[PDB]
Paper text:
As an example demonstrating the effectiveness of this new approach that connects x-ray crystal diffraction and molecular modeling with Raman spectroscopy of solutions, glassy states, and crystals, the present work addresses the high-resolution 3D structure of the extrinsic protein PsbP of photosystem II (PSII) from spinach chloroplasts, Spinacia oleracea. PsbP and PsbQ proteins apparently maintain the ionic environment during water oxidation, and they control access by substrates and products, in particular limiting access by reductants other than water. The tobacco PsbP structure presented three unresolved chain segments, one of which was the N-terminus where 15 residues were missing due to partial degradation.
The analysis of diffraction data to 1.98 Å on such crystals is now reported in the present work. The structure shares with tobacco PsbP the same internal regions that are unresolved in the electron density, and, although the N-terminus is intact in the spinach protein, it too is not resolved. One Zn2+ ion is coordinated by spinach PsbP via the sidechains of His144 and Asp165, corresponding to His142 and Glu163 of CyanoP that coordinate a Zn2+ ion. It has been suggested that one or more of the observed Zn2+-binding sites might be sites for the physiologically relevant ions Mn2+ or Ca2+. If so, this common Zn2+ site might mark a functionally important surface of the protein. In fact the three-dimensional structures of spinach and tobacco PsbP hardly differ, overlaying with an RMSD of 1.07 Å for all 148 resolved Cα-atoms, consistent with their sequence identity of 78% for the 186 residues of the mature protein. The only region of structural difference, at residues 164–173, appears to be related to crystallization. In the x-ray crystal structure with 148 residues resolved, 26 residues are in helical conformation, 75 in β-strands, 23 in turns, and 24 unordered. Crystals of spinach and tobacco PsbP have different space groups and crystal contacts, suggesting that the three regions that are unresolved in both structures might be intrinsically flexible rather than affected by common crystal lattice features. The x-ray crystal structure of PsbP, as well as the modeled structure, shows 75 residues in β-conformation, substantially less than expected from Raman measurements in solution, where at least 87 residues are predicted in β-conformation.
Numbering used by the authors: 16 to 89, 108 to 134, 140 to 186
The structure:
Amino acid sequence: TEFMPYNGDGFKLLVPSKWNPSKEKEFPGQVLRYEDNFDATSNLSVLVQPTDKKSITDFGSPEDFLSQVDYLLGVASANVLESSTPVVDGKQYYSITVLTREGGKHQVIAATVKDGKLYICKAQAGDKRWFKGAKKFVESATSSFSVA
Ligand SMILES: [Zn+2]
């Protein structure tokens, strides 16, 4: 109904059914981008980049990882609402929720390491759309992200 599964190269996730794919490359390693055409500040991207790390935990804690992929957030200020270290089907993931700025953005990052690749899912919405229904879309897309 409101969500549709997507299968990429080595990963899958749920994308909101009303968002559309964007052909524009915003970040390096970008392989998917979906956006709300009524408010393009609501969007999501999946990045796949090579790495020498063997685990997401080689990055240090969730907050340490966040500091190393901070280009993804563009910030006068970043506030970490929550972080977690969920394990899905054997794989360690990190998940981080960050609020950046009046003007506010809620960004959720989910990440794991597999096969000499760093796989990053980032979903965001603006503060007002967040509380008006976007929170569901942002959190499902990042919660649903899994690699194989
Ligand atoms: Zn907010």
